[PDB]
Coordinates of N, CA, C and O in Angstrom, one line a residue:
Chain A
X5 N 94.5 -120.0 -137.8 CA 94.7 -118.9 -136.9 C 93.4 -118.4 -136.3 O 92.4 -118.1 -137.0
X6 N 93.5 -118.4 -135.1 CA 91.9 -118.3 -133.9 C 91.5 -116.6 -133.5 O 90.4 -116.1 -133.1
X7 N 93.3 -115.8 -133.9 CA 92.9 -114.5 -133.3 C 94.5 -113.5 -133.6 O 95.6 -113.9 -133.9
X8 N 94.1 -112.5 -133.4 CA 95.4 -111.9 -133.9 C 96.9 -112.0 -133.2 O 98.0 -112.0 -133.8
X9 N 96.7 -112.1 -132.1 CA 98.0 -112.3 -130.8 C 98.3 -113.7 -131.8 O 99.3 -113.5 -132.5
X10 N 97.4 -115.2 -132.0 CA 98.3 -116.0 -132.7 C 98.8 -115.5 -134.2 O 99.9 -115.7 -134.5
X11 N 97.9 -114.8 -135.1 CA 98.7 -114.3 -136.4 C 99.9 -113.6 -136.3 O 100.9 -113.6 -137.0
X12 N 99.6 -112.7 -135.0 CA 101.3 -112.0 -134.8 C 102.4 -112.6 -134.6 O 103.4 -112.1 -135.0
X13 N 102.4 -114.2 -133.9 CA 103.3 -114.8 -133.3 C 103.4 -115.9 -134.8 O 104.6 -116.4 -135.0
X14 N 102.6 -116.2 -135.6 CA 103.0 -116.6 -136.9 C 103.6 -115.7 -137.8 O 104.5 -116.2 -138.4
X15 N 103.4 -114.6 -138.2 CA 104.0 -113.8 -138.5 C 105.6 -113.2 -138.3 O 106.5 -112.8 -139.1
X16 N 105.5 -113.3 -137.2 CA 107.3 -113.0 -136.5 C 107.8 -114.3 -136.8 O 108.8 -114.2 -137.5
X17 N 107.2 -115.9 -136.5 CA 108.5 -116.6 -137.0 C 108.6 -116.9 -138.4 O 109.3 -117.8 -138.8
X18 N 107.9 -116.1 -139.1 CA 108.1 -116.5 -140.8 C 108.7 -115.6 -140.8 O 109.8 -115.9 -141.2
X19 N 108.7 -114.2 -140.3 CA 110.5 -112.8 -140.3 C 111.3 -113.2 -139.7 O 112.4 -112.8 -140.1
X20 N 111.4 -114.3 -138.5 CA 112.4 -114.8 -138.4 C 113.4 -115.7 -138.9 O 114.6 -115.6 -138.8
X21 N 112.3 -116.9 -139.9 CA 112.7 -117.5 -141.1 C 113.3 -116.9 -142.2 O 114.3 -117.5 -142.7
X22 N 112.8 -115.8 -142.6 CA 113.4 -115.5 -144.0 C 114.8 -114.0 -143.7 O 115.4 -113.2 -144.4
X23 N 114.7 -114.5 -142.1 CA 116.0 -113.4 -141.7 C 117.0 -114.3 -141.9 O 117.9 -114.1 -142.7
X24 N 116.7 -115.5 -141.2 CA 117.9 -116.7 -140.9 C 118.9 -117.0 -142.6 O 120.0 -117.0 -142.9
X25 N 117.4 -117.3 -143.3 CA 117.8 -118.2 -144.7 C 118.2 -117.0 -145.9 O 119.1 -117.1 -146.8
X26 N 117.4 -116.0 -145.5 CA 117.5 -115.2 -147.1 C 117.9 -114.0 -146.7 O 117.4 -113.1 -147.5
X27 N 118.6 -113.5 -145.8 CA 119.0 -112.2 -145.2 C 118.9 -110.6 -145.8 O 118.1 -109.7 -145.6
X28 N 119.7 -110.7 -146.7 CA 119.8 -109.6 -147.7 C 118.6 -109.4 -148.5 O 118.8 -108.6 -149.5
X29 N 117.4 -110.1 -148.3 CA 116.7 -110.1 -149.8 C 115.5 -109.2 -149.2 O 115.2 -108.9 -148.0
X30 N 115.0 -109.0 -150.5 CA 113.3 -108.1 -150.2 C 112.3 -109.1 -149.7 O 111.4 -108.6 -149.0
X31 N 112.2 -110.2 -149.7 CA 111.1 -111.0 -149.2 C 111.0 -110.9 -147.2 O 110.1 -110.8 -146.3
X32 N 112.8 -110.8 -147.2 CA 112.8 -110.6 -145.2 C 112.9 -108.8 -145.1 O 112.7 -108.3 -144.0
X33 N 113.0 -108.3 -145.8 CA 112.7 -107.0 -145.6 C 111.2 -106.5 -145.3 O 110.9 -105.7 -144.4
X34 N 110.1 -107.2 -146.3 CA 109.0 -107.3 -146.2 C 108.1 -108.1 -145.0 O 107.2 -107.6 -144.3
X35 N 108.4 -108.9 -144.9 CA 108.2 -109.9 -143.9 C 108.8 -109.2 -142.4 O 107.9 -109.2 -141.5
X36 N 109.9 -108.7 -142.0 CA 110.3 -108.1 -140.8 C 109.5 -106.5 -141.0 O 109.6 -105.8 -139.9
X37 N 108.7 -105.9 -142.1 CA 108.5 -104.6 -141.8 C 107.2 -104.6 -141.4 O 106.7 -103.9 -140.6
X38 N 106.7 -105.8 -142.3 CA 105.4 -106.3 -142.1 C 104.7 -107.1 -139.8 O 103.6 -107.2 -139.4
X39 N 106.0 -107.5 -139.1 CA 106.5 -107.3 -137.6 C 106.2 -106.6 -137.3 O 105.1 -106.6 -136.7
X40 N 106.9 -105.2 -137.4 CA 107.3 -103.9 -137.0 C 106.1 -103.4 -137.0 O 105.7 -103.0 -135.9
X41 N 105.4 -103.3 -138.1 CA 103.9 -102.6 -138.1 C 102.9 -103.2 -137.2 O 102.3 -102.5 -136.4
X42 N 102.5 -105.0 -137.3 CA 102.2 -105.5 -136.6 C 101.9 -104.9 -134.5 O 100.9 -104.8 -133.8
X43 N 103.4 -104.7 -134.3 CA 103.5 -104.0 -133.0 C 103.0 -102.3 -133.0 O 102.7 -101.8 -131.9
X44 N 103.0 -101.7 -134.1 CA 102.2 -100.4 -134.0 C 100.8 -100.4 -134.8 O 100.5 -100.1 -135.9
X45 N 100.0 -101.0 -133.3 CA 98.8 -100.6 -134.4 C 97.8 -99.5 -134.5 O 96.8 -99.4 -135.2
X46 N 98.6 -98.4 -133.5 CA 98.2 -97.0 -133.1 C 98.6 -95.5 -134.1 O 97.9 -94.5 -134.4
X47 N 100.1 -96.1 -134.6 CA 100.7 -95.5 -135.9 C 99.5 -95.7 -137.0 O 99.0 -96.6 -137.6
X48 N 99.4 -94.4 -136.9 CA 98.5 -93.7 -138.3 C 99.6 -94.1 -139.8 O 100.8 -94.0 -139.9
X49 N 98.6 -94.4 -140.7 CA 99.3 -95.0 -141.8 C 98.9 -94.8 -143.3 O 99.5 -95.3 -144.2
Chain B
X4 N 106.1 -125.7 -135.9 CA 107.2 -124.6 -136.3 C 107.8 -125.0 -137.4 O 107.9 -126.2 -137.4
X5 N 108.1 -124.4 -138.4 CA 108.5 -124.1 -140.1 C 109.5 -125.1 -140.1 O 110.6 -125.0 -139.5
X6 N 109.2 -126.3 -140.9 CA 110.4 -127.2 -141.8 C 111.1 -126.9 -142.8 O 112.2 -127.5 -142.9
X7 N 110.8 -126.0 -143.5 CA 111.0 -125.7 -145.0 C 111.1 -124.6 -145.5 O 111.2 -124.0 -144.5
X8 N 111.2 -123.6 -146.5 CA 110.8 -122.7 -147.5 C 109.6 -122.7 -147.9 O 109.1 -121.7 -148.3
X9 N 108.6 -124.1 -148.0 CA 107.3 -123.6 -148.8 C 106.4 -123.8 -147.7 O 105.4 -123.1 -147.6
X10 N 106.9 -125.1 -146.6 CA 106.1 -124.2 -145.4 C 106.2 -122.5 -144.5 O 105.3 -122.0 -143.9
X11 N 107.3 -121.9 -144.7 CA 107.3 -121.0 -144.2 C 106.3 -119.6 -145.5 O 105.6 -118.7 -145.1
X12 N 106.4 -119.9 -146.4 CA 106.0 -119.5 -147.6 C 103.8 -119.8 -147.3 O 102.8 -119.2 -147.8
X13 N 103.9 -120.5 -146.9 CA 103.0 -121.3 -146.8 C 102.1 -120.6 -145.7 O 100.9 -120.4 -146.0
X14 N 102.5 -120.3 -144.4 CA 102.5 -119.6 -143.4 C 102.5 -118.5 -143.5 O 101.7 -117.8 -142.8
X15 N 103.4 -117.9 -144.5 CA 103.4 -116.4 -144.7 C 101.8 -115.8 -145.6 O 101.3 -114.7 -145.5
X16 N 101.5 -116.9 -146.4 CA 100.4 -117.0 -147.0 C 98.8 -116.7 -146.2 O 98.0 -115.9 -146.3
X17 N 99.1 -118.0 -145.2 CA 97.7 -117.9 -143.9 C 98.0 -116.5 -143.2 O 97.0 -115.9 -142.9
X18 N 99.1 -115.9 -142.9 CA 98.9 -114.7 -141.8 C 98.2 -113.7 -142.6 O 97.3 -113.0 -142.1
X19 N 98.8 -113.7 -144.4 CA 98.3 -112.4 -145.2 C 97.0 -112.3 -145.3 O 96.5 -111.3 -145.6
X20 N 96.1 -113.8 -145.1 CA 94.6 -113.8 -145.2 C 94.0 -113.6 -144.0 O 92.8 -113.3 -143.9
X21 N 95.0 -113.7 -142.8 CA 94.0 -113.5 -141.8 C 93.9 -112.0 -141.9 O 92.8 -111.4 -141.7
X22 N 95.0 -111.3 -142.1 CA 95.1 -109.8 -141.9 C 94.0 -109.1 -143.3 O 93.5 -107.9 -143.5
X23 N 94.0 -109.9 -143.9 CA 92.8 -109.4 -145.0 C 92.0 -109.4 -144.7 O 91.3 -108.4 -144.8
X24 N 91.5 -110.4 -144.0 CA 90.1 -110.7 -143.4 C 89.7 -109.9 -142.5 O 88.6 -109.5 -142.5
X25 N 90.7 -109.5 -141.6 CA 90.0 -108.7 -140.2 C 90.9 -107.4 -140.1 O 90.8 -106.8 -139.0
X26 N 91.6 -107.1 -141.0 CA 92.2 -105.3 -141.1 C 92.4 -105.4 -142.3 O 93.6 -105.6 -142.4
X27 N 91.8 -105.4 -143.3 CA 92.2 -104.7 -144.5 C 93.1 -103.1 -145.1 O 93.7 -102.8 -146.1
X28 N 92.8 -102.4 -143.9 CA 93.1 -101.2 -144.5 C 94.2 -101.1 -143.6 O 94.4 -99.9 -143.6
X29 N 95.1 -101.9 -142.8 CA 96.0 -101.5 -141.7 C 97.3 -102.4 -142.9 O 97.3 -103.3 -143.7
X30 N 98.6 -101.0 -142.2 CA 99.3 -101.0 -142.8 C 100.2 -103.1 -142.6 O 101.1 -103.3 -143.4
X31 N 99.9 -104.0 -141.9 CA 100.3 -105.1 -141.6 C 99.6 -105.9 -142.8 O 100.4 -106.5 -143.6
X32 N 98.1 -106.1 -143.1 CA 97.6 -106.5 -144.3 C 98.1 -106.4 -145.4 O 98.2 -107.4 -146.1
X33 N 98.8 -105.1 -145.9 CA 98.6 -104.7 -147.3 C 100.3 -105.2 -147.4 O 100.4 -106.1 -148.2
X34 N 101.6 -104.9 -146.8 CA 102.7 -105.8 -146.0 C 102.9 -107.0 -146.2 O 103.7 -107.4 -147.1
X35 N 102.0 -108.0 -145.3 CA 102.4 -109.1 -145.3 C 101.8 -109.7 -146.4 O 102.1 -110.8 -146.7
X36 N 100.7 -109.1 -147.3 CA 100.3 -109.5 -148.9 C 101.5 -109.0 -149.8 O 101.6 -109.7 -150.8
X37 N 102.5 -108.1 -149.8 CA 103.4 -107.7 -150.9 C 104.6 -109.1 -150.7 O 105.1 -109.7 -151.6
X38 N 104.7 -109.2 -149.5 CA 105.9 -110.2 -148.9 C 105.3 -111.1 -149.2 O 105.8 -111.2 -150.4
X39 N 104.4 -112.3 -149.2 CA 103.6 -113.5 -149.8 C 104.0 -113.2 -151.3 O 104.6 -114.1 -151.9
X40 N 103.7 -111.8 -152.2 CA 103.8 -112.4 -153.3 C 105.0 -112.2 -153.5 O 105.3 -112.8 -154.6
X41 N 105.9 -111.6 -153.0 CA 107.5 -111.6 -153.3 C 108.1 -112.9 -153.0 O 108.9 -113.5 -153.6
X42 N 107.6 -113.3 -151.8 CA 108.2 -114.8 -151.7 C 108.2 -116.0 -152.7 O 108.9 -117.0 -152.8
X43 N 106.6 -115.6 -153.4 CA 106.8 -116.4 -155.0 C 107.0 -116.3 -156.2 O 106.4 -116.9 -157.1
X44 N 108.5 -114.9 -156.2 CA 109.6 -114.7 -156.6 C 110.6 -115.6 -157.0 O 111.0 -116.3 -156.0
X45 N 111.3 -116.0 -158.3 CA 112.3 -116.4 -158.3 C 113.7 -116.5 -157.2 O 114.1 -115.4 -156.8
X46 N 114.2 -117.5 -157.0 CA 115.6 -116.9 -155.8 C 117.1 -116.4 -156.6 O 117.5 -116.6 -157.7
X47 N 117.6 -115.7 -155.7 CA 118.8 -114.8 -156.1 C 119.7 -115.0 -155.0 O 119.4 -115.7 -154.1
X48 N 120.7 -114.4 -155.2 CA 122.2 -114.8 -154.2 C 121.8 -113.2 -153.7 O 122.0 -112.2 -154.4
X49 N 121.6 -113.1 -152.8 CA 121.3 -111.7 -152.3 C 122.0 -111.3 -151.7 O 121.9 -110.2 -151.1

């Protein structure tokens, strides 16, 4: 990984992955919240 | 693009270090390290 725009776009398709395969579980809950925050990096935290 | 479970596992691993490395204190770091070590979690029928 060279820079964050590519860590973001690796990031989203491993939430996409573990949306597809493991839906219900904490691993894609984590993984998709871990997205979400990604796109706010202005939200105070 | 992801073959597998331990590549995507795998993957999920390199993003939590990049975000270690260059935001440690941003809420996506500390995230995508809980999710890496949940993913090497036993599996369940969820």
């Amino acid at each position: 990984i060279q820079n964050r725009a590519q860590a973001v776009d690796q990031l989203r398709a491993v939430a996409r992955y573990f949306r597809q395969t493991e839906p219900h579980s904490p691993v894609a809950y984590l993984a998709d919240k871990a997205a979400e925050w990604a796109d706010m990096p202005l939200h105070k935290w």
